[PDB]
Amino acid sequence: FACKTANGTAIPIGGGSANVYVNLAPVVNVGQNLVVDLSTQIFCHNDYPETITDYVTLQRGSAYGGVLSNFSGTVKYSGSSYPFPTTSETPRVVYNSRTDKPWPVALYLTPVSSAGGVAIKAGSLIAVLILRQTNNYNSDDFQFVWNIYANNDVVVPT
Ligand SMILES: CCCCCCCO[C@H]1O[C@H](CO)[C@@H](O)[C@H](F)[C@@H]1O
Predict the structure, then answer these.
(1) Most CB atoms within 10 A, among 10, 77, 106, 145?
(2) Which cysteines are joined by disulfide bonds?
């Protein structure tokens, strides 16, 4: 089991960490959602599907900078919604193929009432997402740590 980003940055067998740089909608009004869809950015595969079934959860999601300060978040994991920053590990997603498959994570961030102006700064850390991988074969239990960075400023109009 290993993962890679849309730009080819990889986290190999045994886990580790990688930076993910995301393009964000430039404008988000109060009452609207800023969508951070990681399913088009993070892809994983099972290295031995003939014998092993891999299980993948979003173990934890933390918010930083402008996201922590200016937004109220939800995380959608494989069709279900949970608070973001996270309060519990999600249920497991099965990886049973060598074909690169999306990690089904998307952040839905709506501005808090105090938000106005530059709510997210270009180049800033916005989130840390921990992918936890286990299997039905041995004791393997690995963390794939994704550091999410904003590629651009996000403005909340006033
Ligand atoms: C002859 C027996 C060969 C055993 C190979 C072990 C491969 O282990 C990697 O791939 C697994 C499947 O994706 C992951 O479950 C695991 F965590 C590890 O990444």
Answers:
(1) 77
(2) none
Handedness of CA 62, 65, 66, 68 (dihedral sign): positive
Q: How far apart are CA 49 and CA 95, in angstroms?
A: 8
Which residues does 21 contact at the CB level (< 8 Å), separation at least 6?
7, 149, 150, 151
Query: 64 alpha carbon to ligand 1 midpoint, in Å?
Result: 34
| Distance from the alpha carbon of residue 142 to the mean position of ligand 1, in angstroms | 12
Superfamily name and number for 1-158: Fimbrial-type adhesion domain (2.60.40.1090)
**Ligand 1 neighbourhood includes 52 CB (under 6 angstroms):** yes
Q: How was this structure determined?
A: X-ray
Taking the CB of residue 152, how many other CB atoms lie within 10 A of it? 15
What kind and span of H or E run contains 111? strand 105-111
